[PDB]
């Protein structure tokens, strides 16, 4: 039962993971910016059509009766998905750094046709960068009939640190530093923005009460021309993030109107008109701080969703590498080091099925569809039972 | 007495050109506010545009904004709006109505037009 | 989108009519009522201030999200459709009008 209890945990994976990426992969057909989780999706898919085939050599205990080209071939692609995985999850965090930090230069970068472009790259970069695994993927002579599948390094009493640093330091150094960099960025983007459209939001409260209780044309000209210098400063500030452009946008024109028409009543000298079309700013302020809390609400909906997915991948494989530059220092494994490497990669190999599972869960959008579409195909089938079960009665 | 009477209603092809016109009187234009509300047939009441001419600040529904261009004559006393690119649903009843006050157009437009019927159709 | 809701009642009754906004009303909503074939009319501005030439059965209430407009004795001339001035929410356009509610006799 030990033996046979690891292959059926990589199977539980490979079956949640087909199934929960399929999921995806007909949701989005049928967050992120529609395109990086669908490259992110196949990545996942590639993999698990050669999980079984790996399966089965753990099975055979070091038998690959299947091929030299498919050694060659799969083995490069479970590499392959470390490399490309990570670095479609770097371009999100570009992507998303760009559309939050740079968003006037990045207004062209962001395009569908340019997109799909960079992720062919991606995806030419990942074999590229993995052309060590191309060179000595041929089978192992394994005594007897058998013949192993791994990486036949030249020297492997010496090219075994070179090998394992590489991988690490491309699909699990580099690209930790590069997502976490552009992370802090967009809190720190993000944070000075929120902060900064509250501070000009705050100039509108402190010369509102002043018109209020203001006794004279030239108060209330001078309170009110500061309110329009904030609500133009903050119409252009709001011109800097990617969910708070094109819905926080449109109703700074009634702001600026109706400062406009206090303004031009100010100029008259019709003070008590003047504070009276000042009054019903409030309602516009009123309503200001609803829309900036519902939209800031949602930004951060956006923002913890893109950090699950890659916290998530880089969480489950953090002890993998533990271990694997653990194993630099120490060469023989103990009983209790072959169960954590086991456990290890269990844990790993879990970004499978988290990753659509958890997407799909964030968000309510998707699980409203979930229930509608499982509630109305099992209706269906039942009507379609009772068009058989009407049947038996009538037919 | 407020009274608002209106004209330019009629029959224009889709793509047409047609300038309504509200006349006023009992008031002085140039400080109010002369709000267009359109009303398809079987429909209920839709905002169409807005003018202040005192300040001359405009605003415009999303769904109108860029093929109308509402514009107020002070000399002449009436407002006008200016409706291009029109397409079938723009056939409704276009009133024109100004609140009690030209800043309090959120507690309801007092005073409304006998309304004029535009017919888009080819 | 949506059709005009019906609502039937006879002479003398005691009617409601309901708006839902999208958040919490503070004193911004308008009541209009429009005959067939005739310009609207203005009803209770403020959501609480009665309007010249209005008698004093039409009243605005506030309940929640919800604005109500209730006729304490309703009479033959006010059957028509009633239009809803929503409370201005940021981005939208400046004035927008909610659906109608149709009173008709009841039989």
């Known amino acids: 039962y030990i033996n046979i209890i690891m292959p059926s945990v990589f199977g539980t994976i490979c079956l949640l993971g087909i199934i929960g990426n399929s999921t995806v992969i007909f949701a989005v057909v049928k967050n992120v910016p529609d395109i990086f989780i669908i490259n992110l999706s196949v990545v996942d898919l590639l993999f698990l059509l050669g999980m079984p085939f790996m399966i089965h050599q753990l099975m055979g205990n070091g038998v690959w009766h299947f091929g030299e080209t498919m050694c060659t071939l799969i083995t490069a692609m479970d590499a392959n998905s470390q490399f490309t995985s990570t670095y479609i999850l770097t371009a999100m965090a570009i992507d998303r750094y760009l559309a939050t930090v740079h968003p006037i230069s990045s207004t062209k970068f962001r395009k569908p046709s340019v997109a799909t472009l960079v992720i062919c790259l991606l995806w030419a970069l990942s074999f590229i960068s993995i052309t060590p695994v191309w060179l000595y993927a041929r089978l192992i002579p394994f005594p007897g009939g058998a013949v192993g599948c791994g990486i036949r390094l030249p020297n492997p009493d010496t090219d075994l640190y070179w090998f394992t640093l590489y991988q690490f330091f491309l699909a699990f150094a580099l690209p930790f530093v590069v997502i976490t960099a552009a992370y802090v960025r967009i809190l720190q983007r993000m944070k000075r923005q929120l902060a900064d459209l509250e501070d000009n939001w705050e100039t509108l409260n402190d010369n509102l009460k002043v018109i209020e209780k203001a006794d004279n044309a030239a108060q209330v000209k001078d309170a009110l021309t500061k309110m329009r210098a904030a609500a133009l400063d903050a119409q252009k500030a709001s011109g800097s993030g990617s969910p708070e452009m094109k819905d926080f946008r449109h109703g700074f024109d009634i702001l600026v109107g109706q400062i406009d028409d206090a303004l031009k009543l100010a100029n008259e000298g019709k003070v008590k008109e003047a504070q009276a079309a000042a009054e019903q700013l409030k309602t516009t302020r009123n309503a200001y701080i609803q829309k900036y809390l519902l939209i800031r609400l949602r930004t951060k909906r956006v923002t913890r969703t893109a950090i699950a997915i890659c916290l998530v991948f880089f969480v489950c494989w953090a002890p993998y590498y533990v271990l694997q530059l653990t194993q630099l220092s120490i060469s023989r494994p103990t009983l209790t080091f072959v169960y954590l490497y086991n456990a290890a990669i269990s844990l790993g190999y879990a970004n499978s099925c988290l990753n659509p599972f958890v997407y799909i869960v964030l968000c309510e959008t998707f699980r409203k569809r979930l229930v509608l579409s499982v509630k109305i195909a099992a209706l269906k089938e039942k009507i379609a039972a009772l068009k058989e079960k009407i049947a038996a009665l009538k037919e | 007495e407020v009274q608002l009477v209106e004209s330019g209603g009629g029959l224009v092809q889709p793509g047409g050109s047609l300038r309504l016109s509200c006349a006023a009187s009992?008031?002085?234009?140039?400080?109010?506010?002369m709000h267009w509300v359109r009303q398809a047939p079987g429909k209920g009441l839709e905002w169409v545009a807005s003018?202040?001419?005192?300040?001359?600040?405009?605003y415009y529904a999303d769904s109108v904004k860029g093929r109308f261009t509402i514009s107020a004559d002070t000399s002449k006393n009436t407002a006008y709006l200016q409706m291009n690119s029109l397409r079938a649903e723009d056939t409704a009843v276009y009133y024109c109505?100004?609140?009690?006050?030209?800043?309090?157009?959120?507690?309801?437009?007092?005073?409304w037009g006998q309304g004029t019927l535009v017919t888009v159709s080819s | 989108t949506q059709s005009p809701s019906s609502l039937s009642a006879s002479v003398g009754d005691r009617v409601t009519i309901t708006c839902r906004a999208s958040?919490?009303?503070?004193?911004?909503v308008a009541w209009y009522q429009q005959k067939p074939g005739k310009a609207p009319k203005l009803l209770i501005y403020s959501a609480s201030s009665l309007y010249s030439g209005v008698p004093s059965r039409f009243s605005g209430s506030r309940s929640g999200t919800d604005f109500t407009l209730t006729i304490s004795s309703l009479q033959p001339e006010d059957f028509a459709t009633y239009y809803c001035q929503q409370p201005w929410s940021w981005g939208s356009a400046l004035i927008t009008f909610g659906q109608g509610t149709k009173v008709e006799i009841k039989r």
């Open positions: 958040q919490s009303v503070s004193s911004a």
């Open positions: 003018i202040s001419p005192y300040s001359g600040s405009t």
């Open positions: 009992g008031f002085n234009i140039y400080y109010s506010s």
């Open positions: 109505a100004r609140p009690w006050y030209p800043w309090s157009y959120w507690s309801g437009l007092d005073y």
